[PDB]
Write a protein that binds this ligand. Structure first.
Ligand SMILES: N#Cc1ccc(N2C(=O)[C@@H]3[C@H](O)CCN3C2=O)c2ccccc12
Length: 248
């Protein structure tokens, strides 16, 4: 109960975008709001991550890198859950003041990615994902993308990741488990976790392209964002840093 206790305890609260729901759904205004929300979420993900059990075990530089690389996916996963819980996956609940309907999914020019995120969101329902399974999975997501040539202290990372996999196994396996149930459950969740990496890559590519042409579409990028997108995101896109997949 100690592990789960801290996961619930450190879970971020409601984060609003500050979007003007009175202005028209322009690509510019929507994306400017997603960016600002992205920044706000980054702030919370950093304080959240740093308060995770064993996170301080990681070397100093590995700490921020692991957060910056996995940030997009962490936002994807949590947002999918928010969508499931609040609107039954009908729309994408980015924030209480920024809910995407089909019109907004289209106006943002991110329809394809939105569509995939809505699918992931639906998976929480189909799979009957537990609020506890969700928390553990989100935590594991933090340690799911690293430089192909390793970190400053890979050994500490590997141990940290190993322990979080075990916690998941512990949660998704405390009841009479065996056959199509114990491993059935684990396979389902690991497959679900892998499914977030392709969404994050698509989002990374899209965000990168948008930053590059930002002054041409009147889309505003916050400081921390422009930096992460221009410094860490290209490493993922060029293959230097890659997701850790369970399958295939
Ligand atoms: N909660 C929240 C939240 C906030 C911003 C984004 N998000 C980004 O960081 C990037 C840039 O804004 C352009 C495309 N994009 C996004 O949609 C999210 C993506 C997926 C899930 C949640 C997101």
């Amino acid at each position: 109960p100690i592990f789960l206790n801290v996961l619930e305890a450190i879970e971020p609260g409601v984060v609003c975008a500050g979007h003007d729901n009175n202005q028209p759904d322009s690509f510019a205004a929507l994306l400017s709001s997603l960016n600002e929300l992205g920044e706000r979420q980054l702030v919370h993900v950093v304080k959240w991550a740093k308060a995770l059990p064993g996170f301080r075990n990681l070397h100093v530089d590995d700490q921020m890198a692991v957060i910056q690389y996995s940030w997009m996916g962490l936002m994807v996963f949590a947002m999918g859950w928010r969508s499931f819980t609040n609107v039954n996956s009908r729309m994408l609940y980015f924030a209480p003041d920024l809910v995407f309907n089909e019109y907004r999914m289209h106006k943002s020019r991110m329809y394809s990615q939105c569509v995939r995120m809505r699918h992931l969101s639906q998976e929480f329902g189909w799979l009957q994902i537990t609020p506890q399974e969700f928390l553990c999975m989100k935590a594991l997501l933090l340690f799911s993308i690293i430089p192909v040539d390793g970190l400053k202290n890979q050994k500490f990372f590997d141990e940290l990741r190993m322990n979080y996999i075990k916690e998941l196994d512990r949660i998704i396996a405390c009841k009479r488990k065996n056959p199509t149930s114990c491993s059935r459950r684990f396979y389902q969740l690991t497959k679900l976790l892998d499914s977030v990496q392709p969404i994050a890559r698509e989002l990374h590519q899209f965000t990168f392209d948008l930053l590059i042409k930002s002054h041409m579409v009147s889309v505003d990028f916050p400081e921390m964002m422009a930096e992460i997108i221009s410094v860490q995101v290209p490493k993922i896109l060029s293959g230097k840093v890659k997701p850790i997949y369970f399958h295939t």
